[model samples]
Target chain A: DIQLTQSPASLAVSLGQRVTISCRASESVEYYGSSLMQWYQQKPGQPPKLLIYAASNVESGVPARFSGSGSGTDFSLNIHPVEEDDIAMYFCQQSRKIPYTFGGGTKLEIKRADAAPTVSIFPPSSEQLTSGGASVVCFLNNFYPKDINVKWKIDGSERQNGVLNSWTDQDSKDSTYSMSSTLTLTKDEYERHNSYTCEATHKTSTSPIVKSFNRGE
Target chain B: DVQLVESGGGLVQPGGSRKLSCAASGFTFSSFGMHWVRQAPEKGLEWVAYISSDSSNIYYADTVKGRFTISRDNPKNTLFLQMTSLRSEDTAMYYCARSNYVGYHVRWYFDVWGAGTTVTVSSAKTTPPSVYPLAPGSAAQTNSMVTLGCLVKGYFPEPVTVTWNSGSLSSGVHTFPAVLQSDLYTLSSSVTVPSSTWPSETVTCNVAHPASSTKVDKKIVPRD
Candidate 1:
């Protein structure tokens, strides 16, 4: 397994600006000793879409602006002429494994404030793990929306008690940004892969939404 | 928005055959194929392949091509990926994704992911083997100086590994404690491995578990 260091969890860029998101592997997957990479983008409420695959070769329908470069341990996702629709979440993934893994996430937005888009983590909500005695955690992937502050609360109240929290917002090769927050719960707190929520609030999105992982539905 | 609502879960023994569906919802299921991903509880993620929801397009790499079959019967609004020659390794979560604007057309990344489902393996025990008795073949210990135990930690959850390390939590370092976590899950027992050091720059935990049931569900630290 390789480490994926994605930067600028969130970013705000002007229209038509060339943006890039970067995904650095903890180790070189270029097993052939070459840089082989894959990239993806995901918008809110929508499934993540594939963009650049196998590093350089573009997937069948990816727009021309969304290009990928570099190989091996380091790779980048570049959008030559950014568009309004491009303001969404992007992730870098690797196809090297017989299976694949994904970077947390990168959010891109159209800046209006100086509108310099930036990424930040507002605390995350607490959840119980399914395995008894196993700690349960749910985090908001890298999110860099316009000016809104984000946090993960349980039900509807603010969380500030005891939680091991780590904040990170990374910048990807395509000039995008993202941020994430983690919440830890004691094993008994986790109730069968259910009862988990990751809420995100940004000044830019339509409404505050909570991503919940319910018990076997 | 393209939606892939997969078929319900199933259980199979080693050498048994299993079939599941990634039923499509919303939008046009025919426009795109279904992509499969595998994930174990605490492991990394893996990509199986894509099956055209319309024409049963098949694309697979690695030995996975042999044991898995991906097909589609769009009229039923369902995409199929079947795994034969099931081994305990084949027990995992299978997902289906549909995208009209995948990579070449979009050049971003997979926008959609199926809600993951799991497939568990191994011999079943009744009320006999609860988390309490610890099961046979495994051992546990508790001393004033140390509390150590061994047990097959159930099947590997995801493609994640935990090596022993004493470096910055973020930086990968020497791992001794981490290995213990690994052995207890699958098969348990007593065996102490030597202490080892890994440079921070060289190690990292992957995001998801493996993609196939046939694959091993263990944390993989790449070695030169």
Candidate 2:
């Protein structure tokens, strides 16, 4: 499953209050070793309008308010919502793989006062795990007070049985936090030779993340 | 009768990777070949490569010899060109056009242009967005970060902005700023965001000139 976490978790932008939503990829995508990027817009209960289809090509009939940018590991979604005119949910995707993922969900409150600031995502990290190791511990440091969630999956499937450990700091700006998940695998060549993934997620964009290719000796 | 939309910024490293794009619409998008050109922020134009709507390919100039390549997807009426082994000089405003003809067999000029947007490939350490998981089962998440830019000949940029929000962006959409430039006073301020991937959240480049609207909207999505 592609992990998705949306930010602002919610927001309230005034007329023309610039709003930008972000999306990310788990790995550097290379479709047949080529750079493939695309953008889209999904309306309530309707199919997504093919806004910016391929990396930079625009689909026919799309309005001017919709636009996209960036390629290769990083990109963003910008919108200029005017009062009584702008209100709805926004989502971003990478048209480069299977088991695709999404940014949690960004809702433009449309009203002003008391809006949650759109926090950037929980920066993810990756490392190689040695074979024959009893367990590979994956860590999401300084998760902050933002209530982070962790899940483990392999090749993209969630592990039914995994351990999640969470802690809080109640201090730092928003009380930064951290968490880790442990995977217990049945000793077998296929399970060992194959790759396993550990995912950490949160409303910080609600982005799903995974640590892959972990093997046990 | 052909309309060309635009795209926005891409943040690359001092020695990293970056890919930008351009799309077309209106007339028979697939009937013509799309050309890729490079203009390093307020610079002259340099032909890069070309791709027919069918994904066919070619290198229109020697400047694109080793670093550039183009491809297309006819069904989507889209064209793409990428440059690897990036350098500061590589940073530029990459534009795509739906040329009246293919190749430089005769005249080599983009009769119809996309007004051109900016792709600020900077070396400054910054955050970038991704497309994966953002649009699952939809193809590459790259589509999510993309922003589209558009312009109708001789029209004002303000009207374009109004139409988008009243129509496109009202329900959570992607948007970029539009401006009228000088050289091409007839240029339009329009762009279709990239798949929202690395597409900088906001667009800041539009027409440049003494036209009705001559200014640059420098809205960019920052690295988190």
- Show where candidate 2 strays beyond 4 Å: A1-217, B53-57, B101-108, B126-224
Best by the DockQ measure: 1
Per-residue alpha-carbon lDDT of model 2 for A1-217, expressed as tens digits?
Answer: 3333446665655666667766565564434533244444433433223455334444567556656665566555666544443465555544344323344556555442221212111111111113322333344544433456666656556666533233322212322334333343433423444555656666544556544543321
10 residues in a row with least lDDT, candidate 2 chain B = B128-137
Model 1 off-target regions past 4 Å? A1-21, A24-91, A94-217, B102-109, B126-224
lDDT of 2 by residue, B46-132 (tens): 456666545554645655467656777666666666666666676566666554422232222244566565554444322111111
lDDT of each: 0.50, 0.44
**Fnat of each prediction, in sequence:** 0.19, 0.00
The sequence of per-residue lDDT tens digits that candidate 1 reaches over residues B113-222 is 77756776544421111111111111111122211112112333323333211212322121111111322222211112212322123222212213332312222122
TM-score of each: 0.40, 0.28
Which of the numbered candidates is closest to the native, going by highest lDDT? 1
> Residue B42 error for model 1, in Å?
2.1
